[PDB]
Nucleic acid binder design. Structure first.
Ligand SMILES: [Mg+2]
Ligand SMILES: [Mg+2]
Ligand SMILES: [Mg+2]
Ligand SMILES: [Mg+2]
Ligand SMILES: [Mg+2]
Ligand SMILES: [Mg+2]
Ligand SMILES: [Mg+2]
Ligand SMILES: [Mg+2]
Ligand SMILES: [Mg+2]
Ligand SMILES: [Mg+2]
Ligand SMILES: [Mg+2]
Ligand SMILES: [Mg+2]
Ligand SMILES: [Mg+2]
Ligand SMILES: [Mg+2]
Ligand SMILES: [Mg+2]
Ligand SMILES: [Mg+2]
Ligand SMILES: [Mg+2]
Ligand SMILES: [Mg+2]
Ligand SMILES: [Mg+2]
Ligand SMILES: [Mg+2]
Ligand SMILES: [Mg+2]
Ligand SMILES: [Mg+2]
Ligand SMILES: [Mg+2]
Ligand SMILES: [Mg+2]
Ligand SMILES: [Mg+2]
Ligand SMILES: [Mg+2]
Ligand SMILES: [Mg+2]
Ligand SMILES: [Mg+2]
Ligand SMILES: [Mg+2]
Ligand SMILES: [Mg+2]
Ligand SMILES: [Mg+2]
Ligand SMILES: [Mg+2]
Ligand SMILES: [Mg+2]
Ligand SMILES: [Mg+2]
Ligand SMILES: [Mg+2]
Ligand SMILES: [Mg+2]
Ligand SMILES: [Mg+2]
Ligand SMILES: [Mg+2]
Ligand SMILES: [Mg+2]
Ligand SMILES: [Mg+2]
Ligand SMILES: [Mg+2]
Ligand SMILES: [Mg+2]
Ligand SMILES: [Mg+2]
Ligand SMILES: [Mg+2]
Ligand SMILES: [Mg+2]
Ligand SMILES: [Mg+2]
Ligand SMILES: [Mg+2]
Lengths: 47, 110, 65, 72
RNA sequence: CGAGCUGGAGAUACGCUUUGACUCGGGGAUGUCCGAAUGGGGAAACCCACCUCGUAAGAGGUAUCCGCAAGGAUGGGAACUCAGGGAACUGAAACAUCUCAGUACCUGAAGGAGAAGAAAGAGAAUUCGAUUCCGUUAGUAGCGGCGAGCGAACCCGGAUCAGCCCAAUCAAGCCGAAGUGGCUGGAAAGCUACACCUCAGAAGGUGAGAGUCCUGUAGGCGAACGAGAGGUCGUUGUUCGUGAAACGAUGACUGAAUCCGCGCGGACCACCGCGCAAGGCUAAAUACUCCCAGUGACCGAUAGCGCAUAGUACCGUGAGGG
RNA sequence: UGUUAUGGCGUGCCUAUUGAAGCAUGAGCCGGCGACUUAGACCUGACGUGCGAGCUUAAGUUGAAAAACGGAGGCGGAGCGAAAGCGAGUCCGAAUAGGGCGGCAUUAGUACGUCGGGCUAGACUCGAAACCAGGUGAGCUAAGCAUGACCAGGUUGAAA
RNA sequence: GUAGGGGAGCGUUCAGUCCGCGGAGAAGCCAUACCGGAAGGAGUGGUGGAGCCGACUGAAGUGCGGAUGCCGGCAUGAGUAACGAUAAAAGAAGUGAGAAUCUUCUUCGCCGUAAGGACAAGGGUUCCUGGGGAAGGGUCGUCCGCCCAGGGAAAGUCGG
RNA sequence: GAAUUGGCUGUAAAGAUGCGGCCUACCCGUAGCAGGACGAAAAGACCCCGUGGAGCUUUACUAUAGUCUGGCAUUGGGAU
């Protein structure tokens, strides 16, 4: 049957993207929080 | 945790100096410094000497072939010698010229 | 943390010279027209707790007062 | 927001049953205690040239007397 | 500094270096594209322009807010600081005031600290004299469904001292004492026989355990650059829960005296005392610890950080976990 | 010592229970990790030590391959009362009769340490269902909006 | 003799001090008929290859069989179920260390509004050539969508 | 849990391969069956208990978004 994850480049970028995350204080707060954890993958646009 | 760390990456002797082997199997044999590596504290002296093997490689030559070459040693089994004493000897830094630093014993100098 | 003093026990309990503990007899606030006059007299008073009840009170006010 | 001084801020607000009695009832019990907020109003006057802005009430009186730095 | 070097990488080749390399210290030049991003757009790291110079190559400019200008701002920073907003579980062996707690969390602004500060004060001696911090007073005085429980301050002793103006030496580095012989052993530092330096027996490395083999230590030297008002209603703050409720604090309404005047001293009056509000700045003692150094009756591979390194592999759309 | 034959004898362990071999719980096995602690200058006892009608410092200061100073404070020294206040007395009372107390027929405390226990804190370890805050999610699914796509062939035969 | 109270001790790390061992060989590991009232403790021998015992004193992350405990390794079930559509295979030939599985030939069988062909979304070198064979392939592989290397993708007019 | 794991009748916490008595049974396995091993799985979801929880209901208690309402402010002049 049709499963949850149904890949869509533009979806992913527009939703979990760097521009997206920067558009809001809470997403900015993710960015900083992640940087802090030392993630290789700051954000989806890093893939 | 490199070997030079303990000895401040510093060689207590130069390349081309003659050296007496203080410690080990080659006690006292003598030779010219052919190669000296400060950071690793390893030094080559025409006396240690081993038989190494060249295994498969068709260069040099298809067959194997063995070989006689000296194997470097740890700085701390090396010393500058003193032409008089002829033996294992410490070093003092004194002066000459004309801005040159030099190396004496209890009776300079090498 | 300094052990606090049990503020309820302030106005109702007394330490004694030796080291026993006292309080006031009870039933004196609307159980009056009862009476009897000797009860009313005997109650307004004061008195020593039986004994089992001593340790707790002592622990209620560490300063004695 | 006020003309002179920010304003808005508040203030919880409480209320109490068994309200009163013989100056002492038994006592006043209080059933409420929540959280509210206070405010002011609006009208248009000037400064340096042409503005409009919000005005407190205390501001409209204070300014109707004379300009405490801004004009009418 | 003075002989090696050509990164972890250990691998072949090319080669560099006593005309001073490599490494260390110190300044500069270059510094693509994204990111406050700031020419315009955009699904970050990509697409599209305009202007001035230039021969083209190329270079520079083109955001918003304060300002005339010069110049300033935006963003980031683990904790620490102040401010706007502000939980519940829970405790009360049920619960609603109460408590958890002005804690968690959210937002803001800022610094290497910050806050606070120069008495309309604390107070009861007609005493003290800016603030913060530590001890203490003290679980005292008080608060409280007077239940659970909450809880000062003054004095005294310390840390550090400060009050002025306005409106009519450390950061590269160099020098640096003194031992040999025999024995065991694969190997000498160990054994042994005599021997020496010590302002130096801290420590690490050396084929096992080395004061005297190497690096060092005590001690000395050391740079062109480098661094040092009142009121009433509604509420609330401190021990302050409407209590007899003073005082500060504002949201609403209202609104006085200026020296024989004004504000306080816990309703309120007289008296007696302390005080000069409505105008601003202020270092020092204090907090924290991303980073650096030293230490340890701390850990040594299920321990210790999650990592002998990795926020990787791996899981998740993502936040996030790991 | 190992191993065995035969005889006698014999209902795993833990937990939980009135009562477990129980057909009650836990557990495949072995190895490692794995649970009564810390704190305060709190409370109260036991033991010990130093001073002893007295005992002790805290912050801090200086020194620091050590410790010394530091008396502010705290504990004993008197009790009794709601308190004022009185004081070997005190309180009730008008005095008596009584309670508490001193003397008593005698009685030592204080600072530190180790221990037993109390309190407050996660307070022996592991375990909820939940409650609250800030955020991440409509690439699944429930719908809306804009914009495109798609429905072999056959039957039936309404109005006009 | 259960909860519980009390008493004397055993062993573990770390710490101070004393004794003192150790390449003619430490800790750890292994075997053992000896010792002590018990925790426990020595003797000898085998292992190992660089640190460590005894005594007194101090401080603890200090003693395990349990917690459907945690991490890890290995057992049982067991050579058991299964090897993923009942569309189906046969021979020759080649290759190769090895072939029911790879390559070629000849046939056979199964889809044929599909099980054929072309886009989009998504994936990301999986395409082509040459090589490889540990693991991945539910067997086997000499083969592969796996591993190694090198090549390959061309726009004024298709899409943006 | 470990197993060297029969039947009857009895006894035991009251449903015994393990306890008692008596009976039966040489050792090992393969294909098969499902009576037992109170067989496995899920710390019973019925039931009770806990001064546990949560959704929901009301004329249970308490508050409250919202909403009606008097007074004050924006808010002024005149005529009866
Ligand atoms: Mg060099
Ligand atoms: Mg831009
Ligand atoms: Mg507030
Ligand atoms: Mg609640
Ligand atoms: Mg409760
Ligand atoms: Mg900021
Ligand atoms: Mg008021
Ligand atoms: Mg209040
Ligand atoms: Mg006031
Ligand atoms: Mg290990
Ligand atoms: Mg039972
Ligand atoms: Mg029992
Ligand atoms: Mg059984
Ligand atoms: Mg059982
Ligand atoms: Mg049970
Ligand atoms: Mg089981
Ligand atoms: Mg004593
Ligand atoms: Mg004590
Ligand atoms: Mg306890
Ligand atoms: Mg006994
Ligand atoms: Mg020791
Ligand atoms: Mg050890
Ligand atoms: Mg176990
Ligand atoms: Mg299970
Ligand atoms: Mg396991
Ligand atoms: Mg078989
Ligand atoms: Mg079977
Ligand atoms: Mg079978
Ligand atoms: Mg089968
Ligand atoms: Mg198949
Ligand atoms: Mg078949
Ligand atoms: Mg052949
Ligand atoms: Mg086949
Ligand atoms: Mg052929
Ligand atoms: Mg197809
Ligand atoms: Mg592509
Ligand atoms: Mg295979
Ligand atoms: Mg081949
Ligand atoms: Mg291919
Ligand atoms: Mg063409
Ligand atoms: Mg049998
Ligand atoms: Mg029976
Ligand atoms: Mg039987
Ligand atoms: Mg038996
Ligand atoms: Mg069956
Ligand atoms: Mg149950
Ligand atoms: Mg309302």
């Amino acid at each position: 049957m049709k499963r949850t994850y149904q890949p869509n480049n533009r979806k992913r970028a527009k939703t979990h993207g760097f521009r997206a995350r920067m558009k809001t204080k809470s997403g900015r707060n993710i960015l900083a929080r992640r940087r802090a954890k030392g993630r290789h993958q700051l954000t989806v646009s890093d893939e | 945790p490199s070997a030079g760390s303990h000895h401040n990456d510093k060689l207590h002797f130069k390349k081309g100096d003659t050296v007496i082997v203080l410690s080990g199997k080659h006690k006292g044999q003598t030779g010219k410094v052919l190669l000296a590596l400060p950071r690793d504290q390893k030094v080559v002296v025409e006396g240690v000497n081993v038989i190494t093997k060249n295994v498969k490689p068709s260069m040099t030559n298809p067959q194997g072939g063995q070989e006689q070459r000296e194997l470097a040693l740890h700085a701390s089994k090396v010393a500058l010698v003193d032409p008089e004493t002829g033996k294992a000897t410490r070093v003092r830094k004194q002066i000459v010229d004309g801005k040159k630093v030099r190396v004496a014993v209890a009776s300079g100098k090498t | 943390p300094k052990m606090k003093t049990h503020k309820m026990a302030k106005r109702r309990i007394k330490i004694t010279g030796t080291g026993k503990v006292m309080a006031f007899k009870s039933g004196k606030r609307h159980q009056n027209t009862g009476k009897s006059g000797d009860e009313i007299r005997g109650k307004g008073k004061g008195f020593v707790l039986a004994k089992a009840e001593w340790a707790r009170m002592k622990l209620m006010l560490p300063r004695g007062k | 927001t006020g003309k002179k001084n920010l304003v808005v801020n508040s203030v919880i607000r409480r209320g109490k049953a068994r309200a009163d009695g013989g100056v002492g009832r038994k006592t006043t019990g209080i059933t409420k205690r929540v959280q509210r907020a206070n405010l002011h109003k609006k009208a248009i006057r000037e400064n340096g040239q042409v503005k409009t802005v919000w005005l407190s009430a205390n501001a409209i009186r204070t300014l109707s007397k004379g300009p405490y730095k801004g004009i009418e």
